[PDB]
Amino acid sequence: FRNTILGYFDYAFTAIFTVEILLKMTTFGNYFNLLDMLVVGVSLVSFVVKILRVLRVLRPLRAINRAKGLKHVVQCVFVAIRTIGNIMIVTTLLQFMFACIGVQLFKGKFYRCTDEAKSNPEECRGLFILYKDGDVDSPVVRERIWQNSDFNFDNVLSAMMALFTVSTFEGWPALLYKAIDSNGENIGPIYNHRVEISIFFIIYIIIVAFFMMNIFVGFVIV
Amino acid sequence: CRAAVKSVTFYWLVIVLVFLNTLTISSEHYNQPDWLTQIQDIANKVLLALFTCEMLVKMYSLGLQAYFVSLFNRFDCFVVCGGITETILVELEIMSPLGISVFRCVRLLRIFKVTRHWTSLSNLVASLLNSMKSIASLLLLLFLFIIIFSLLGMQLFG
Amino acid sequence: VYFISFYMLCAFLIINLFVAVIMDNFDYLTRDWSILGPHHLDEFKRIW
Amino acid sequence: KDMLILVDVSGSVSGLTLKLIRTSVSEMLETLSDDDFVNVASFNSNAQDVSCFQHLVQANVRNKKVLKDAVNNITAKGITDYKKGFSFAFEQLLNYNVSR
Amino acid sequence: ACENKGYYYEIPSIGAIRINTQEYLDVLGRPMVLAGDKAKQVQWTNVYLD
Amino acid sequence: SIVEWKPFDIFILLAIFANCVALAIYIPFPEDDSNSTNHNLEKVEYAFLIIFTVETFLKIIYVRNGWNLLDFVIVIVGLFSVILEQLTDVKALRAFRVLRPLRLVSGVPSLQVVLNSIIKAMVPLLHIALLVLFVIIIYAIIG
Amino acid sequence: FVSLVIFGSFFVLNLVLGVLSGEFSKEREKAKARGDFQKLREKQQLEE
Amino acid sequence: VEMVLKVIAFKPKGYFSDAWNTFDSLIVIGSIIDVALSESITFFRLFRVMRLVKLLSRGEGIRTLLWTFIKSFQALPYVALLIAMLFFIYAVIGMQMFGKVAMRDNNQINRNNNFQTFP
Amino acid sequence: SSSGMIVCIYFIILFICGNYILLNVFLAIAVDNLADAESLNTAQKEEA
Ligand SMILES: *[C@@H]1O[C@H](CO)[C@@H](O[C@@H]2O[C@H](CO)[C@@H](O)[C@H](O)[C@H]2NC(C)=O)[C@H](O)[C@H]1NC(C)=O
Numbered sequence: 001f002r003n004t005i006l007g008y009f010d011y012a013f014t015a016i017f018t019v020e021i022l023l024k025m026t027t028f029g030n031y032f033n034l035l036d037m038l039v040v041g042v043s044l045v046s047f048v049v050k051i052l053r054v055l056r057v058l059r060p061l062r063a064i065n066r067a068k069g070l071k072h073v074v075q076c077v078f079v080a081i082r083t084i085g086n087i088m089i090v091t092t093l094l095q096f097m098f099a100c101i102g103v104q105l106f107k108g109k110f111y112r113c114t115d116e117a118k119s120n121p122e123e124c125r126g127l128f129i130l131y132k133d134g135d136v137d138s139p140v141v142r143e144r145i146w147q148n149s150d151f152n153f154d155n156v157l158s159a160m161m162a163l164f165t166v167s168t169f170e171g172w173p174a175l176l177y178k179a180i181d182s183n184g185e186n187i188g189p190i191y192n193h194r195v196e197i198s199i200f201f202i203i204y205i206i207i208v209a210f211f212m213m214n215i216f217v218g219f220v221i222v
Numbered sequence: 223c224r225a226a227v228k229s230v231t232f233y234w235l236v237i238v239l240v241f242l243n244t245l246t247i248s249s250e251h252y253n254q255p256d257w258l259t260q261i262q263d264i265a266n267k268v269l270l271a272l273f274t275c276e277m278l279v280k281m282y283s284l285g286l287q288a289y290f291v292s293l294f295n296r297f298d299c300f301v302v303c304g305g306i307t308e309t310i311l312v313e314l315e316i317m318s319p320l321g322i323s324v325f326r327c328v329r330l331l332r333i334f335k336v337t338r339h340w341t342s343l344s345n346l347v348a349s350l351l352n353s354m355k356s357i358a359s360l361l362l363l364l365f366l367f368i369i370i371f372s373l374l375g376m377q378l379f380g
Numbered sequence: 381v382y383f384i385s386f387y388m389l390c391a392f393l394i395i396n397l398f399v400a401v402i403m404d405n406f407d408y409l410t411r412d413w414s415i416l417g418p419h420h421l422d423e424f425k426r427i428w
Numbered sequence: 429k430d431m432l433i434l435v436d437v438s439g440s441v442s443g444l445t446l447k448l449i450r451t452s453v454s455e456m457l458e459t460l461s462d463d464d465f466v467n468v469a470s471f472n473s474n475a476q477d478v479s480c481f482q483h484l485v486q487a488n489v490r491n492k493k494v495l496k497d498a499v500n501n502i503t504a505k506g507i508t509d510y511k512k513g514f515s516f517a518f519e520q521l522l523n524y525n526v527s528r
Numbered sequence: 529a530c531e532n533k534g535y536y537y538e539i540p541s542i543g544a545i546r547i548n549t550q551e552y553l554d555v556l557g558r559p560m561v562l563a564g565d566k567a568k569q570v571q572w573t574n575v576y577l578d
Numbered sequence: 579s580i581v582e583w584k585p586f587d588i589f590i591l592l593a594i595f596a597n598c599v600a601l602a603i604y605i606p607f608p609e610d611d612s613n614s615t616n617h618n619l620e621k622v623e624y625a626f627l628i629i630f631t632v633e634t635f636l637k638i639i640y641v642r643n644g645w646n647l648l649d650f651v652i653v654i655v656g657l658f659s660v661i662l663e664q665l666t667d668v669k670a671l672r673a674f675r676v677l678r679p680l681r682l683v684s685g686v687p688s689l690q691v692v693l694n695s696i697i698k699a700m701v702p703l704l705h706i707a708l709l710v711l712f713v714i715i716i717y718a719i720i721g
Numbered sequence: 722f723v724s725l726v727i728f729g730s731f732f733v734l735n736l737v738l739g740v741l742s743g744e745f746s747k748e749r750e751k752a753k754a755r756g757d758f759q760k761l762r763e764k765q766q767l768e769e
Numbered sequence: 770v771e772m773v774l775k776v777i778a779f780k781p782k783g784y785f786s787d788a789w790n791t792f793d794s795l796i797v798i799g800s801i802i803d804v805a806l807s808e809s810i811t812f813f814r815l816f817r818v819m820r821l822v823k824l825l826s827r828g829e830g831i832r833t834l835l836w837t838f839i840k841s842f843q844a845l846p847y848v849a850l851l852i853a854m855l856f857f858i859y860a861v862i863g864m865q866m867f868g869k870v871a872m873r874d875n876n877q878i879n880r881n882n883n884f885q886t887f888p
Numbered sequence: 889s890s891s892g893m894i895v896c897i898y899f900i901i902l903f904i905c906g907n908y909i910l911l912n913v914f915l916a917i918a919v920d921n922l923a924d925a926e927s928l929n930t931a932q933k934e935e936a
């Protein structure tokens with residue numbers, strides 16, 4: 001019912017904007033003008049439809065040209081964006097090399113079975129007995145699945161996304177301890193196999209997350 | 223042959239070879255088809271041969287003692303020598319399964335050859351290279367700060 | 381792409397506001413209380 | 429079989445890896461019958477029996493219950509001494525005073 | 529383990545307790561199979577519920 | 579009339595690093611467990627404390643300087659800890675030995691001035707820290 | 722909690738970053754009179 | 770007692786000139802009405818700690834540091850409008866796309882974290 | 889309970905004195921080395 005009620009509000013609201021867009025065209029005959037005709041145009045055409053329902057989120061951006069302060073603040077953003085475009089090309093190129101190195105290092109080593117007793121896809125089949133919370137008196141039957149990690153280094157894109165998540169400092173200890181246990185190409189992990197592989201993550205964090213991000217803020221300040 | 227080096231048709235041709243070098247490194251993936259590794263490792267030898275020929279051209283054309291002044295040429299010849307080292311190493315009786323993947327990193331550095339002429343990037347690089355005695359001094363103090371608290375944690379929560 | 385673009389744009393806009401605000405206070409952030417400043421003038425006004 | 433279970437109760441086995449040892453001994457005692465003689469001992473810089481038996485027992489339902497109860501009541505503390513632990517175990521298999 | 533004719537086992541989790549604590553009977557059965565037909569004797573267990 | 583200049587001025591500085599290295603290979607086993615490496619490291623710590631004690635009488639000629647005050651404290655506390663440990667939370671009192679790597683900062687003036695320049699930039703942040711303390715107190719009371 | 726994060730973290734981090742960036746500028750303008758930039762300028766000018 | 774002593778000493782017409790005294794009225798009136806209801810009830814009892822900043826902020830090393838930043842946040846009010854616009858646009862866009870995802874308890878889209886409502 | 893809650897001051901001093909040094913080691917480099925890049929650029933734009 002709320003959608004139906006709000007559906008009548010747009011009916012009236014869209015009339016006004018059609019009146020003003022034709023009213024100005026009477027006395028005229030900028031790229032900022034096409035957007036105003038587009039916002040009312042998407043509400044008209046809508047009268048698939050899912051894309052047109054999302055594309056009509058441009059309504060709050062129609063006030064940019066009707067506010068001097070808002071227009072000036074918006075222009076300053078694109079002025080600053082082009083200035084910070086030199087350090088963006090460097091921190092993106094540097095992330096790609098680390099993504100390639102991570103692809104070389106852990107390319108398909110982040111696999112594991114549902115139960116930590118089978119260490120290859122052949123044995124990781126069928127059902128297994130799972131013991132809840134460590135109790136040996138509460139077993140439950142579960143199916144074992146040989147599944148990959150959510151953030152893996154299979155290709156250059158998954159590696160780039162995982163490195164982005166690491167550089168955002170979120171969930172990176174999990175990936176670090178998952179990469180330390182990375183045993184082989186298509187076999188399960190071993191507890192603390194190669195601790196010394198943490199040097200990759202430490203160097204990446206120091207070079208990009210700490211240095212390349214602070215240089216960005218410093219450059220903006222200067 | 224300096225007319226074929228200080229020209230515009232050679233610098234813009236080296237960029238294509240560098241890009242094709244990056245393309246063969248940023249194409250490996252888990253369970254990659256058997257026909258892709260063949261292209262990868264033939265392009266390996268072919269493009270390495272082109273790069274070492276390019277180094278031989280840019281090694282005896284202006285001056286051997288004036289090239290060592292430039293850090294890039296000494297840095298790039300190191301990569302060229304490392305690359306020519308592993309071609310026979312892999313084909314010979316030195317398998318090094320972990321040594322195959324580690325060097326590809328040391329051979330994928332040839333991507334810095336597209337950033338030599340910036341004049342907006344090297345201007346701050348030359349400034350941060352002059353303050354290396356302070357950059358490596360702040361880091362060595364941060365490392366000492368991390369070491370002391372790690373040793374202290376090893377006692378309290380060891 | 382939704383989450384990556386949001387996390388990039390929001391961080392950039394937040395630091396843009398931070399530095400924009402800091403720019404307006406370089407008079408106070410580099411006041412150099414030792415030599416002079418409006419605080420001395422305020423003290424003089426209160427004493428006068 | 430004349431089994432004799434040696435359990436490491438030193439300091440380093442404290443935590444999860446002791447709960448696994450106590451469960452492993454309990455499941456191991458279930459593979460023994462009335463013809464099998466067993467005893468459980470623990471060592472941490474000093475080897476001693478974990479129960480009141482002090483030698484091999486017939487490992488029937490009555491005796492296995494006592495050993496299982498005592499195994500589920502051990503604690504981890506001290507240093508590791510394999511020389512003293514194995515000498516104690518080798519001495520109990522040379523008894524021949526009792527039925528084996 | 530094998531300096532004294534034994535065998536070595538890994539028990540990293542609870543799921544490996546059930547299987548690894550019964551495999552010691554394979555080693556103990558080596559002298560029985562090498563005996564030959566002198567070890568083929570019928571034995572009867574204790575009374576137990578089926 | 580002991581004299582010090584450059585003969586051992588690098589020797590004691592390298593001994594500090596050697597003791598820092600010996601403090602990094604000590605594995606803190608749980609529930610009072612140990613191995614052979616820790617057994618040897620205890621005797622090595624004895625010798626390391628001997629050198630530090632032997633270098634507190636020659637540097638007594640100093641007693642008021644902060645760096646020397648800490649240097650003397652991290653020696654007297656170690657001696658007291660050894661004495662009271664031999665005549666027995668005693669094992670938690672040897673946590674003063676982690677300040678020995680911090681002693682290395684005073685031996686290198688080039689790296690010593692950097693730390694001074696870092697502490698000297700903390701006075702302006704005291705107002706912000708004081709504001710944060712009041713915000714924390716107000717929100718804790720409101721909660 | 723929302724007002725605590727905005728005031729406790731975002732407001733304070735702006736204060737810390739601004740005040741710290743005001744000391745760096747204060748220590749840079751004072752070190753400019755010494756001639757630290759001059760030494761860098763003359764060495765960079767004597768290379769091309 | 771302090772308030773009734775200050776009002777009869779500072780000419781109430783002029784007593785409301787100061788911003789500190791006017792904001793101190795609410796706590797005093799708030800604290801004087803909660804005592805009668807000790808035997809909707811915490812609105813005034815909660816602001817009993819607000820009197821702290823009324824006198825523990827008189828040091829002109831921390832008050833000026835605040836004032837120079839609050840007076841600068843309102844000097845640039847259109848910059849935060851960009852953040853508000855970005856939040857609105859992204860929340861609305863996420864509402865159509867991820868608004869139909871089910872609400873479970875062990876997932877990250879749960880009763881407390883979801884796209885179902887604009888807040 | 890007990891007196892084991894007082895050991896939380898180890899993870900507070902470490903987080904406070906650690907995130908403060910990181911702003912004096914990675915931000916003090918970008919506002920003292922890059923702040924020169926502009927200077928250099930500006931100085932190289934007037935001598936060219
Ligand atoms: C029973 O065990 C004991 C000790 O394990 C064996 O040793 C003898 O014990 C008896 C009585 O205690 C005494 O003769 C001596 O104290 C021990 N030594 C010798 C040389 O006899 C003993 O041999 C075992 N068997 C019997 C029948 O006692």
Ligand SMILES: [Ca+2]
Binds near residue numbers: 438439507611
């Ligand atoms: Ca042990």
